[PDB]
Design a protein around this ligand. Structure first.
Ligand SMILES: O=[N+]([O-])c1ccc2[nH]nnc2c1
Ligand SMILES: [Ca+2]
Ligand SMILES: [Ca+2]
Length: 62
C-alpha cells in the first residue's frame, strides 16, 4: 500500500493528483478513458479537495 502510493505520487507531495492517476492508468494500459479515470479519482477523493491523500487511497484499495 505505502509502496503503491509512492509509485503513483510521482512528485512526492503526499497526494495523488488526477494528472498523476491518468499517468498511472496509461502506463499500465487500463481500458479507461482519461475522463473515466478522472471520475475514479473524484470518487476516491472523499473530502473533495482535488487530491487523493493516503487515507483516501487506502479506503479505495480496501
Ligand atoms: O486515486 N484513485 O482514485 C485510485 C483508484 C484506483 C487505483 N488503482 N490503483 N491505484 C489507484 C488509485
Ligand atoms: Ca503527487
Ligand atoms: Ca482529498
Amino acid at each position: 500500500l505505502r509502496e503503491q502510493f509512492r509509485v503513483e505520487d510521482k512528485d512526492g507531495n503526499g497526494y495523488i493528483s488526477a494528472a498523476e492517476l491518468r499517468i498511472v492508468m496509461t502506463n499500465r494500459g487500463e481500458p479507461l478513458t482519461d475522463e473515466e479515470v478522472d471520475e475514479l479519482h473524484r470518487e476516491t477523493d472523499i473530502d473533495g479537495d482535488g487530491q487523493v491523500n493516503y487515507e483516501e487511497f487506502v479506503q479505495r484499495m480496501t
